[PDB]
């Protein structure tokens, strides 16, 4: 958890640096709540490597949600 | 008494519900567009 938390800090620092081309604190929590399927209308970025790395993080988002739920129901049994 | 096989691989023969008729309803949507083109004639 704190490993992917600092990965979120890393990609937010990348989104600050490489898009010197709105990301002070908004880049953290708008790009954090998407693992939990928030309501939360985020600031839509340019069509760049920004939205690419969002989809990359979205893969790990859904695979962590599925893995935690499959563990959790498996702890109710056995 | 025949309890359980063990599987992790997705049954690719269970993909018949996935290519359940996507393209057929897409063809009906094409005929819907052609009927829209005849409704442009009216």
């Amino acid at each position: 958890w704190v490993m992917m938390f600092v990965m979120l800090l890393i990609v937010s620092a990348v989104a600050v640096f490489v898009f010197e081309y709105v990301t002070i604190g908004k880049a953290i929590w708008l790009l954090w709540g998407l693992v939990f399927n928030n309501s939360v209308p985020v600031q839509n970025p340019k069509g760049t490597t920004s939205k690419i790395m969002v989809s990359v993080w979205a893969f790990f988002a859904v695979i962590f949600l599925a893995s935690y739920t499959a563990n959790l129901a498996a702890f109710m049994i056995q | 008494e025949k309890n359980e096989v063990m599987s992790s691989q997705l049954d690719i023969d269970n993909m018949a519900g996935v290519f359940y008729m996507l393209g057929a309803a897409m063809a009906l949507s094409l005929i819907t567009f052609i009927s829209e083109h005849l409704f442009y004639w009216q």
Binding site: - | V5, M6, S7, Q9, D11, D13, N14, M15, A16, G17, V18
Partner: protein, 48 residues
């Protein structure tokens, strides 16, 4: 005393009462998995 049954031409031999029962089977092996094309509750939930 060998493990043998009769057919109709086994008129020649004279069995006693059969002590055990058996039959004719075939032997195959296992598969791995089953078919279930993601549609179990789909006509069931289709009512709702």
């Amino acid at each position: 005393v060998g493990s043998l049954t009769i057919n109709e031409e086994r008129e020649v031999v004279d069995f006693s009462v059969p002590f055990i029962e058996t039959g004719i089977s075939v032997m195959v092996s296992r598969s791995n998995g089953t078919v279930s094309p993601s549609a179990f509750l789909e006509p069931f939930s289709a009512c709702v």
